Design a protein around this motif. Structure first.
Motif, short mmCIF file in Angstrom:
data_model
loop_
_atom_site.label_atom_id
_atom_site.label_comp_id
_atom_site.label_asym_id
_atom_site.label_seq_id
_atom_site.Cartn_x
_atom_site.Cartn_y
_atom_site.Cartn_z
N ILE A 40 11.40 15.13 27.05
CA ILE A 40 12.70 15.00 27.47
C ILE A 40 12.75 14.61 28.76
N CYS A 41 13.98 14.12 29.29
CA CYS A 41 14.06 14.12 30.67
C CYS A 41 14.38 15.19 31.41
N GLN A 42 14.11 15.46 32.70
CA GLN A 42 14.46 16.72 33.40
C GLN A 42 16.05 17.03 33.74
N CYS A 43 16.91 16.07 33.55
CA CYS A 43 18.24 16.11 34.07
C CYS A 43 19.12 16.45 32.82
N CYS A 44 18.98 15.46 31.86
CA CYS A 44 20.36 15.94 30.69
C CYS A 44 19.37 16.46 29.60
N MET A 45 17.97 16.37 29.54
CA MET A 45 17.24 17.13 28.59
C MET A 45 17.21 16.23 27.05
N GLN A 81 20.12 6.70 31.61
CA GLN A 81 21.35 6.75 31.80
C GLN A 81 21.89 7.84 32.68
N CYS A 82 20.83 8.61 33.00
CA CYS A 82 21.12 9.79 34.02
C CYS A 82 21.12 9.01 35.58
N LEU A 83 20.10 8.10 35.79
CA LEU A 83 20.21 7.14 36.99
C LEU A 83 21.21 6.17 37.10
ZN LIG Z 1 18.64 12.36 30.98
#
Ligand SMILES: [Zn+2]
Ligand SMILES: [Zn+2]
Lengths: 357, 39, 35, 127, 240, 212, 102, 145, 89
Positions: I68-73, I13-15
């Motif tokens: 976690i992801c790097q963008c939205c954590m 969902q960041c992509l």
């Molecule tokens: Zn994310």
């Protein structure tokens, strides 16, 4: 015999102290002709700390020393060819390349130097050891020199670009001796934490740690055939099978105390230089001390001066160049016209009391 | 006190985990850039 | 005084028997040059 | 005998015993010529990739003389082109690069057995 | 003295800054490590107190007072399963050291876990450590009265240490209990193995004389003088 | 001007050589008010030294001395090494052996100064460090007592932290600074951690009430 | 004579505590398993909490006893010798250490 | 020159500064290697049970004996173990050769007049007068014997 | 290892929804929010015409240790914050 297996019914039938011992008496070591002194060379102003032989064509050897100067000695006549100065402190290890006309020498002055043996000058100085550098091995076919010292890491130096390419971090103490092999494990090292490491240089980690020695593993040596390394603590010498990290054999080194140097012949003769001059020759495949000599120092010197510090064979394997603390270079000849009769060496006699085997 | 011997040397384990700087030294300039091979 | 028993040859060396400019490895010159 | 395995699993009696003592003519082979070339070319390529990392990261302009996109993410639910940004030659490249000091933890998963021998241990006051 | 928790929190910062300062200058000095690790036990924070002993073991893991004190620190706070893991790492790192093996034993002796010291001793006597381990392992089964188990040990103990003071210890075991059928079976096994393994040359002339005499003087007490007499002839002929 | 050796100056010289050894004579003569380092070195090597024997000669030693004194006439420092005696002893006996053929308070002040100097082994860095720690403890005790009085007045003021001397300076109190966890073993330390957390929270609960 | 090696000293300390454990059972007698979780892999041992207590108390008792047996040795040896000149306690413990050498 | 300056502004100095050996720190570095070599050889001799305390006291005897060799006082410790005394006498004679040959080499420099430091003149003055009186004391004993 | 590095952990969902995303790799970009140590800053945009650059704020080692992801954590599975994740377990 079979009665041992049928009454004392085993689960392995090899891990019994008797079945191990009876196969040792079942086998005989190869006989080797003994070694005698042939030439004594007095040329340095200090201790001889390291000797390297010319790997190609065997004309000369070079002895890095305690008077900060390397001297090049001709092998045949024993005369002095040239003197290579350029360190300010004691030259600890000297190693010549076979694929290159390059001479690498590391002192305790924290410097790793290369030498153009077509020019006899210092080219390509290396930089980065925090303390004195004990040892260098030129990697075969790969164009890397492995240096190590009191720093406790092995820095893999590219030759051409003088870059600390790979730093090997596993030890706990000063590294006394480092070796380079063509396949994995490509770097074999030994330090004062009684360990011998087998290095996977690509991953930068240890394949196998050999914790079998008690006290600082002061010297190792590679076997020129048959792909094995032999490491020496103060009391025991153990040959190691590379590519498995297997303990091949324990040698019969008892009451020798402090082994300073090792060198392995093509003819499976292992030389063990002791700090107490008591220099001993071991059959490599068995572990039999078949000769034990003692040296004469000089006209006048201290009794501590009787100590072998460094040693290597020549390319033929029939000469043994040892450098000792009495500022001397002693060449040891294996005497001809000795047979299995009239020169048997020491008797092959393993015992239970020593738990060595 | 304040004037001591060494119990152990400075290990290179510590400087390996540091981040590098990439300062340009005078002795690390390119020189003798071609290796010589023996026959 | 005649040490090591005269079977061994003992030599004291204080000077180099080569010039320092002597290469110590012959440089491999394949093509003969007349320049 | 309820827990026979669990005690000291990493140490065996086989590690103490030599292997040449059973036969002195055990052959430990030299590495074959096809084996050294498979290990040389893997190592030489790894070293040359490391040297080219060091020369390219140095700010010397005279170091390019001496010298991957479209990755799959989210179990290849997205094909992502990876490109490099055109760096301004005046602004400091590697803006996060500082000279900081880092202490490293030790990764100890398996204990190394210190495999001495047992015990010639009697000693007077001579030492 | 400390009044409240904020004065305690400032007290703990001052000592931990002090001790971590001397350990940063001196990675070594194992006594300085233990005094800071003992400090954290007094502060009742065992999570910190486990950490200093773990950090001190990364400097010198061959230092035996450091292993014993950290084991005892886990035992004094009744963390018995933290100690079982720790003594397991003690004997797996340093199997030569006798103290670390005894330490495992007398704790499980203290807990009356007789099947864990038995499993421990089976492993420890498999690594061929020496005669102090076996003699404490035959003394363990005498405590447990396992007479059939201790007879199995001497079957293995003579194979690990082939020498008459291990064989004659096994006949001092059997003649302590007076079982005549078992004692001469051990006596028959001891004198055949000297004959069977004559060529190996591991028993001396004075050493084999102790076996022949202790065989004969036992047969003299068993009122069979003709077996006492005949074995002297076979031994003198078997060994002239 | 050349002074004579009193028994006070000798016992100071014995204790100083016992303190400083025999190769620091100007440091020894700094304790002796009126006495050169050349004098105090010569006084030790001729009189005070317990290696020296101030004994009468034996009957053999008298004949052996007369034998040497014709061998080396007259080389008294050489004879005294042969005789293992002091040299003025060898001369004064030899003259007697040829005559066989006949026909407070200033001292107590420098003693107390020497007694003070011998019993002080620290130096300037140590003595300044001792004083700076005594100040730092006294600065702490006053700040704690100041907070206790304000707590009696109902005003709660927290303890100030020592400021960061450098950038990555560490508050050891806030966190376990280099937490090396115990290696995971097979014996399932689950209920033991609960008893610790119960006991550790119980202990800090008792600090908020009883103190210590 | 001479010293005792560490393997011999560890056995004698081993034997002494067994006699303390023998008389502890005799003084008690005078007055009157293994579960291996397959998912986690962990092994759990059920044991008596009294014997864990008696293990914990005895180690604290042996620690205090050696702490007191050394503390009295500190107080005695400070007040034994005063003949040779000293300056502080570290001088006194060093020159006494010279006496054990000879 | 400026490219190192600006990166020192942005990134700071590297914490991995390793000092090369130089004329000013040669005598100190010669001692660090000498104490390590003596420490290693004595610790192998030791049968067992030697720690950071016992390795700390034995390196005193080395420092004391080097003073005794400079003093020409014979260095004898009663009760010293003969292997360790064999080791310490060896490294002194190792250090003696460097101490004597550096004293010879610098006299040849001073007579040529080629760049000797003001401190180095006084040091070489002090090294010779040890050697001259030591040669004197040897000659006195040979006449006496 | 500076020449062998993991691919970045980013959410779906960041992509966003689009297929091909042009992402910019800077080999020592910003430093991590958590460990304050430098890393490869990846940044991208959902569409071509968007107006918000989505940066990776933390390094892949801090993203792996928390999963976690790097963008939205947010957590890689369940897509919830870390404080709510550790409370539900
Ligand atoms: Zn994310
Ligand atoms: Zn991070």
């Amino acid at each position: 015999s079979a009665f041992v297996n049928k009454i004392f019914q085993p689960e392995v039938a090899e891990e019994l102290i008797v079945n191990r011992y009876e196969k040792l008496l079942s086998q005989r070591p190869e006989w080797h002709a003994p070694w005698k002194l042939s030439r004594v060379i007095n040329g340095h102003l200090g201790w001889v700390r390291c000797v390297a032989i010319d790997p190609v064509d065997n004309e000369w050897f070079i002895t890095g020393s305690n008077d900060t100067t390397m001297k090049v000695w001709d092998l045949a006549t024993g005369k002095l060819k040239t003197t290579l100065a350029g360190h300010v402190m004691t030259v600890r290890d000297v190693a010549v390349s076979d694929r290159h006309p390059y001479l690498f020498s590391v002192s305790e002055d924290k410097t790793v130097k290369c030498w153009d043996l077509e020019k006899n000058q210092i080219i390509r100085d290396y930089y980065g050891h925090l303390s004195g550098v004990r040892t260098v091995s030129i990697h075969p076919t790969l164009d890397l020199i492995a240096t190590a010292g009191r720093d406790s890491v092995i820095k893999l130096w590219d030759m051409r670009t003088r870059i600390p390419v790979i730093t090997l971090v596993g030890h706990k103490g000063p590294i006394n001796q480092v070796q380079c092999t063509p396949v994995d494990p490509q770097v074999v090292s030994s330090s004062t934490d009684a360990t011998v490491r087998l290095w996977d240089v690509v991953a930068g980690k240890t394949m196998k740690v050999l914790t079998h020695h008690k006290r600082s593993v002061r010297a190792t040596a590679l076997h020129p055939k048959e792909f094995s390394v032999a490491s020496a603590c103060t009391d025991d010498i153990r040959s190691w099978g590379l590519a498995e990290g297997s303990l091949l054999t324990n040698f019969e080194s008892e009451k020798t105390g402090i082994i300073n140097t090792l060198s392995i012949n093509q003819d499976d003769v292992l030389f063990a230089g002791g700090d107490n001059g008591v220099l001993s020759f071991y059959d490599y495949k068995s572990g039999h001390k078949y000769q034990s000599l003692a040296t004469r120092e000089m006209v006048g010197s201290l009794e501590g001066e009787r100590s072998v510090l460094c040693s290597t064979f020549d390319k033929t394997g029939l000469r043994l160049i040892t450098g000792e603390a009495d500022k001397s270079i002693k060449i040891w000849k294996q005497d001809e016209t000795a047979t299995k009769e009239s020169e048997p060496g020491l008797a092959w006699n393993p015992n239970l009391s020593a738990k060595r085997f | 006190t304040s004037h001591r011997p060494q119990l152990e040397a400075r290990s290179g384990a510590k400087a390996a985990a540091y981040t590098p700087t990439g300062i340009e030294h005078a002795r690390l300039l390119p020189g003798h850039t071609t290796l010589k091979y023996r026959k | 005084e005649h040490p090591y028993g005269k079977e061994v040859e003992v030599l004291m060396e204080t000077k180099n028997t080569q010039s320092p400019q002597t290469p110590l490895v012959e440089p491999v010159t394949e093509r003969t040059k007349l320049q | 005998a309820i827990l026979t395995d669990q005690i000291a699993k990493n140490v065996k009696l086989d590690d103490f015993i030599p292997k040449r003592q059973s036969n002195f003519e055990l052959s430990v082979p030299l590495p074959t010529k096809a084996e050294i070339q498979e290990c040389t070319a893997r190592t030489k390529s790894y070293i040359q990739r490391l040297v080219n990392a060091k020369l390219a990261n140095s700010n010397n302009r005279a170091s390019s003389r001496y010298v991957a996109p479209a990755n799959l993410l989210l179990n290849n639910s997205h094909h992502i082109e990876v490109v490099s940004k055109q760096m301004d030659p005046l602004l400091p490249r590697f803006v996060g690069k500082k000279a900081r000091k880092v202490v490293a933890p030790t990764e100890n998963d398996e204990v190394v057995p210190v495999l001495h021998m047992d015990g010639g241990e009697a000693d007077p006051n001579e030492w | 003295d400390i009044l409240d928790l904020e004065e305690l929190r400032e007290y703990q910062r001052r000592k931990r800054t002090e001790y971590e300062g001397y350990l940063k200058r001196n990675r070594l000095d194992m006594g300085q490590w233990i005094r800071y690790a003992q400090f954290e036990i007094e502060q009742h924070d065992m999570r910190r107190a486990r950490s200093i002993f773990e950090r001190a073991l990364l400097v010198d893991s061959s230092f035996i007072p450091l292993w014993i004190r950290y084991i005892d620190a886990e035992l004094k706070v009744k963390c018995i399963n933290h100690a079982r893991n720790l003594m397991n790492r003690a004997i797996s790192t340093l199997p030569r050291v006798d103290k670390l093996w005894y330490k495992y034993l007398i704790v499980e002796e203290s807990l009356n876990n007789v099947e864990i010291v038995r499993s421990l001793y089976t492993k420890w006597c498999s690594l061929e450590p020496g005669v102090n381990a076996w003699n404490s392992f035959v003394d363990f089964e005498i405590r447990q009265k396992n007479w059939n188990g201790v007879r199995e040990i001497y079957s293995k103990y003579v194979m690990a240490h082939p020498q008459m003071q291990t064989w004659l210890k096994w006949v001092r075991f059997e003649n302590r209990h007076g079982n005549t059928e078992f004692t001469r079976s051990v006596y028959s096994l001891a004198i055949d193995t000297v004959a069977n393994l004559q060529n190996l040359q591991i028993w001396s002339d004075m050493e084999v004389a102790k076996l022949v005499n202790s065989f004969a003087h036992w047969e003299a007490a068993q009122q069979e003088y003709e077996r006492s007499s005949a074995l002297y002839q076979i031994a003198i002929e078997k060994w002239p | 001007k050349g002074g004579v050796w009193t028994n006070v100056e000798d016992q100071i010289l014995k204790a100083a050589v016992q303190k400083y050894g025999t190769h620091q004579w100007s440091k020894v003569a700094s304790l002796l008010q009126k006495k050169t380092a050349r004098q105090s070195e010569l006084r030790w090597n001729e009189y005070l030294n317990p290696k020296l024997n101030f004994t009468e000669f034996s009957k053999e030693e008298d004949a052996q001395l007369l034998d040497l004194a014709r061998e080396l006439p007259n080389q008294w420092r050489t004879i005294a090494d042969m005789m293992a005696r002091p040299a003025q002893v060898c001369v004064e006996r030899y003259n007697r052996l040829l005559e066989s053929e006949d026909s407070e308070d200033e001292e107590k002040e420098m003693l107390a100064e020497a007694r003070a100097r011998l019993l002080n082994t620290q130096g300037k860095k140590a003595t300044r460090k001792i004083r700076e720690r005594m100040l730092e403890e006294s600065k702490r005790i006053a700040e704690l007592q100041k907070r206790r009085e304000l707590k009696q007045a109902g005003i709660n003021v927290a303890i100030k932290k020592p400021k960061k001397k450098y950038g990555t300076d560490i508050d050891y109190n806030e966190d376990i600074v280099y937490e090396q966890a115990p290696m995971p073993g097979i014996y399932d330390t689950s209920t033991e951690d609960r008893q610790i957390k119960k006991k550790f929270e119980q202990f800090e609960r008792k600090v908020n009430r009883k103190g210590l | 004579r001479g010293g005792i090696s560490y393997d011999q000293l560890a056995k004698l300390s081993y034997e002494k505590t067994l006699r303390n454990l023998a008389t502890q059972t005799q003084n008690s007698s005078k007055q009157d398993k293994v579960q291996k979780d397959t998912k986690t892999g962990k092994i759990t041992i059920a044991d008596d909490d009294k014997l864990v207590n008696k293990l914990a108390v005895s180690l604290q008792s042996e620690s205090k006893k050696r702490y007191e047996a050394r503390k009295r040795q500190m107080q005695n040896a400070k007040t034994l010798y005063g003949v040779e000149s000293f300056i502080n306690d570290k001088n006194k413990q060093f020159n006494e250490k010279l006496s054990r050498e000879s | 020159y400026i490219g190192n300056l600006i990166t020192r502004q942005f990134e700071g100095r590297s914490n991995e500064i390793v000092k090369t050996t130089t004329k000013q720190r040669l005598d100190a570095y010669y001692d660090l290697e000498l104490r390590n070599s003596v420490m290693d050889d004595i610790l192998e001799m030791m049968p067992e049970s030697i720690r950071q305390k016992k390795a700390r006291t034995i390196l005193q005897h080395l420092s004391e004996a080097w003073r005794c060799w400079k003093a020409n006082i014979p260095w004898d410790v009663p009760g010293m173990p003969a292997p360790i005394k064999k080791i310490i006498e060896r490294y002194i004679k190792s250090k003696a050769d460097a101490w004597v040959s550096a004293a010879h080499y610098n006299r040849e420099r001073i007579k040529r007049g080629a760049h000797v430091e003001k401190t180095m003149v006084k040091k070489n003055l002090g090294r010779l007068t040890r050697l001259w009186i030591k040669n004197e004391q040897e000659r006195q004993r040979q006449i006496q014997k | 290892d500076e020449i062998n590095e993991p691919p970045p952990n980013i959410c779906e969902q960041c992509l966003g929804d689009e297929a091909n995303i042009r992402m910019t790799k800077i080999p020592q970009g910003s430093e991590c929010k958590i460990c304050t140590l430098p890393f490869t800053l990846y940044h991208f945009k959902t569409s071509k015409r968007s107006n918000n650059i989505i940066k990776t704020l933390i390094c892949v080692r801090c993203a792996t240790q928390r999963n976690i992801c790097q963008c939205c954590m947010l957590d890689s599975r369940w897509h919830i914050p870390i404080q709510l994740r550790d409370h539900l377990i």
